[PDB]
Amino acid sequence: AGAGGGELFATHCAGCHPQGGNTVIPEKTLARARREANGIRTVRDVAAYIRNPGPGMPAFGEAMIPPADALKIGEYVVASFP
Numbered sequence: 001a002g003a004g005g006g007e008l009f010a011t012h013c014a015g016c017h018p019q020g021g022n023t024v025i026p027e028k029t030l031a032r033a034r035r036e037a038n039g040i041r042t043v044r045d046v047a048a049y050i051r052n053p054g055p056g057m058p059a060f061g062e063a064m065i066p067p068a069d070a071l072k073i074g075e076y077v078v079a080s081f082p
C-alpha cells in the first residue's frame with residue numbers, strides 16, 4: 001500500500017528482531033556479517049528469505065507482504081543493520 005520498508009519492518013519483523021537483534025535465537029541477528037555468512041547479502045536475498053526462512057521464523061507469503069513490499073523490507077534491512 002506504499003508503506004516504507006521501515007514501517008513494514010516495525011509491523012512484521014521487529015517483534016522478533018527489535019533493533020536488528022533476535023529474541024528467539026539470539027545468535028541469529030540481522031547484523032551484516034552474521035546474515036552474510038548465511039548468504040543473505042542483497043535486497044533480493046532478504047525478499048526471498050522471508051518466503052522460506054529458517055526454523056522458528058514464520059514464512060511471509062505474497063498475500064501478507066506483496067513483492068514490492070518484500071523489496072522495501074530488504075532495502076531497509078541492508079541499510080539499517082551493519
Ligand code: HEM
Nearest residue numbers: 012013016024025028034035038040050054055056057058
Ligand atoms: C519480517 C518480515 C522479518 C524479516 C525481514 C526477518 C529477517 C530475518 C533474517 C535476515 C534472518 C537471518 C537468517 C540467517 O540464517 O542468518 C532471520 C532469522 C530468524 N528470524 Fe526473522 N525476520 C522477520 C520476521 C521474524 C519473526 C516475526 C520472527 C519471530 C517469530 C523471526 C524469527 C527468526 C528466527 C528464529 C531466525 C533464525 C532462523 C534460523 O535459521 O536459525 N523473524 N530473520
